[PDB]
Design an enzyme around this catalytic site. Structure first.
Site, PDB file in Angstrom:
ATOM      1  N   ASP A 102       0.844  -1.195   0.000  1.00  0.00           N
ATOM      2  CA  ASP A 102       0.000   0.000   0.000  1.00  0.00           C
ATOM      3  C   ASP A 102       0.878   1.244   0.000  1.00  0.00           C
ATOM      4  O   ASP A 102       1.834   1.337  -0.769  1.00  0.00           O
ATOM      5  CB  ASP A 102      -0.910   0.009   1.241  1.00  0.00           C
ATOM      6  CG  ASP A 102      -2.166   0.852   1.059  1.00  0.00           C
ATOM      7  OD1 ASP A 102      -3.191   0.298   0.616  1.00  0.00           O
ATOM      8  OD2 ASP A 102      -2.144   2.061   1.373  1.00  0.00           O
ATOM      9  N   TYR A 125      -2.485  11.460   1.553  1.00  0.00           N
ATOM     10  CA  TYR A 125      -3.126  11.669   0.261  1.00  0.00           C
ATOM     11  C   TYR A 125      -3.245  13.142  -0.136  1.00  0.00           C
ATOM     12  O   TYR A 125      -3.248  13.457  -1.317  1.00  0.00           O
ATOM     13  CB  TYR A 125      -4.509  11.037   0.253  1.00  0.00           C
ATOM     14  CG  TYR A 125      -4.536   9.552   0.554  1.00  0.00           C
ATOM     15  CD1 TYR A 125      -4.700   8.619  -0.473  1.00  0.00           C
ATOM     16  CD2 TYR A 125      -4.424   9.077   1.867  1.00  0.00           C
ATOM     17  CE1 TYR A 125      -4.745   7.258  -0.213  1.00  0.00           C
ATOM     18  CE2 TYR A 125      -4.479   7.698   2.143  1.00  0.00           C
ATOM     19  CZ  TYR A 125      -4.637   6.796   1.093  1.00  0.00           C
ATOM     20  OH  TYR A 125      -4.681   5.435   1.331  1.00  0.00           O
ATOM     21  N   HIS A 154      -6.474  -7.134  -1.778  1.00  0.00           N
ATOM     22  CA  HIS A 154      -5.526  -6.057  -1.450  1.00  0.00           C
ATOM     23  C   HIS A 154      -4.323  -6.440  -0.572  1.00  0.00           C
ATOM     24  O   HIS A 154      -3.185  -6.077  -0.877  1.00  0.00           O
ATOM     25  CB  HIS A 154      -6.290  -4.930  -0.759  1.00  0.00           C
ATOM     26  CG  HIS A 154      -5.499  -3.675  -0.578  1.00  0.00           C
ATOM     27  ND1 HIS A 154      -5.074  -2.903  -1.638  1.00  0.00           N
ATOM     28  CD2 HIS A 154      -5.078  -3.042   0.542  1.00  0.00           C
ATOM     29  CE1 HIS A 154      -4.418  -1.851  -1.180  1.00  0.00           C
ATOM     30  NE2 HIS A 154      -4.404  -1.913   0.141  1.00  0.00           N
TER      31      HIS A 154
HETATM   32  O1  LIG Z   1      -2.640   3.493 -10.348  1.00  0.00           O
HETATM   33  C1  LIG Z   1      -2.455   4.508  -9.404  1.00  0.00           C
HETATM   34  C2  LIG Z   1      -3.314   4.569  -8.171  1.00  0.00           C
HETATM   35  O2  LIG Z   1      -3.162   3.394  -7.462  1.00  0.00           O
HETATM   36  C3  LIG Z   1      -2.935   5.686  -7.250  1.00  0.00           C
HETATM   37  O3  LIG Z   1      -2.990   5.367  -5.897  1.00  0.00           O
HETATM   38  C4  LIG Z   1      -2.049   5.710  -4.932  1.00  0.00           C
HETATM   39  C5  LIG Z   1      -1.107   6.724  -5.140  1.00  0.00           C
HETATM   40  C6  LIG Z   1      -0.185   7.051  -4.133  1.00  0.00           C
HETATM   41  C7  LIG Z   1      -0.201   6.366  -2.914  1.00  0.00           C
HETATM   42  C8  LIG Z   1      -1.172   5.332  -2.698  1.00  0.00           C
HETATM   43  C9  LIG Z   1      -1.197   4.627  -1.459  1.00  0.00           C
HETATM   44  C10 LIG Z   1      -2.131   3.615  -1.235  1.00  0.00           C
HETATM   45  C11 LIG Z   1      -3.050   3.280  -2.233  1.00  0.00           C
HETATM   46  C12 LIG Z   1      -3.021   3.965  -3.447  1.00  0.00           C
HETATM   47  C13 LIG Z   1      -2.071   5.013  -3.676  1.00  0.00           C
END
Ligand SMILES: OC[C@@H](O)COc1cccc2ccccc12
Length: 288
Positions: free
Chosen positions: A98, A204, A268
């Site tokens: 993650d 985020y 996940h």
């Molecule tokens: O394909 C791109 C997407 O997954 C963008 O998601 C994320 C971007 C940056 C950090 C993340 C952290 C956890 C889940 C998703 C994230």
């Protein structure tokens, strides 16, 4: 043999689980988990490694500094660097999931000298992650929840009603599928009581993936190097709602020297959904 304690690095005190002795195996969790998600890996490799599972700043019992600036990728990356160092090491085997994989991936590209081997679970690859957010309409439906995590109103959805939002996101599935025990569940509830959902969210609010001029760039976080040459292993939950499979497409271009294991069954968080399988893939990879 298991200890829990703190470490001062980079202006914070990170709580961390520790077990075993030897070469360092460092685990980085993500949202909305904590060191505990790595329990099965810690029990398994701790007679061959010094297993350390870290609580990312803001999470569970780790200090929770103020201001979005405290949760910038540069900061978090440095956190990881300071930790390998301060635990007595000049390199480690890095296991990521993650948000921990977002950080880990970036760290590894930036400091390949600090990572002997990388093991990565569902989570963003700096290059492909960006690509799929442009081309993959499914990945955009999937990542839509990110647009959402920007709004202030969101934290109450999660904490409200004894963490109703988070319990249904993570606890309900795992209890009914059978990978969470009643103690696992107390573990999580405590971690959310002890950590701050605000700082969890702040990770985020720094993501630069929203403006069209943001999506233009090559890498999810800034990176000079476009190739990672250390041995890398992907262990991937094929049925994960938040990451489409296309994320692993043409990945060898960015990681020559990779091996990939897809669990068609797991979602996940493979590491505690299917521990024994994930564990044996890990073994095999560690000895190749
Ligand atoms: O394909 C791109 C997407 O997954 C963008 O998601 C994320 C971007 C940056 C950090 C993340 C952290 C956890 C889940 C998703 C994230």
């Amino acid at each position: 043999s298991m200890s829990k304690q703190y470490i001062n690095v980079n202006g914070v005190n990170l709580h961390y689980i520790s077990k075993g002795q030897g070469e360092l195996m460092l685990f980085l969790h993500g949202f909305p988990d904590f060191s505990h998600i790595w329990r099965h890996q810690i029990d398994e490799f701790s007679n061959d490694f010094h297993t350390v599972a870290l609580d990312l700043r803001g999470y569970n019992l780790s200090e929770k500094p103020s201001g979005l600036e405290s949760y910038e990728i540069d900061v978090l990356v440095e956190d990881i660097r300071q930790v390998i160092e301060g635990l007595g090491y000049s390199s480690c085997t890095l296991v990521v999931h993650d948000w921990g994989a977002g950080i880990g991936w970036t760290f590894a590209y930036r400091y390949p000298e600090y990572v002997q081997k990388l093991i990565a679970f569902n989570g963003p690859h700096p290059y492909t992650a960006m690509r799929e957010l442009r081309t993959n309409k499914n990945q955009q439906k999937a990542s839509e929840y990110m647009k959402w995590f920007q709004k202030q109103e969101v934290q109450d959805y999660m904490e409200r009603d004894n963490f109703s939002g988070l319990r249904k996101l993570v606890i309900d599935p795992g209890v009914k599928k059978g990978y969470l025990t009643a103690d696992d569940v107390q573990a999580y509830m405590n971690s959310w009581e002890n950590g701050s959902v605000l700082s969890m969210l702040s990770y985020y609010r720094n993501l630069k993936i929203f403006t069209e001029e943001d999506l233009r760039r090559k890498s999810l976080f800034p990176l000079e190097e476009e190739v990672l040459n250390i041995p890398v292993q992907i262990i991937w939950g094929n049925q994960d709602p938040t990451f489409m499979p296309e994320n692993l497409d043409g990945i060898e271009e960015y990681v020559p020297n990779i091996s990939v294991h897809r669990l068609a069954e797991a979602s996940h968080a493979p590491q505690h959904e299917k521990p024994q399988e994930v564990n044996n893939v890990m073994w095999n990879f560690l000895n190749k």
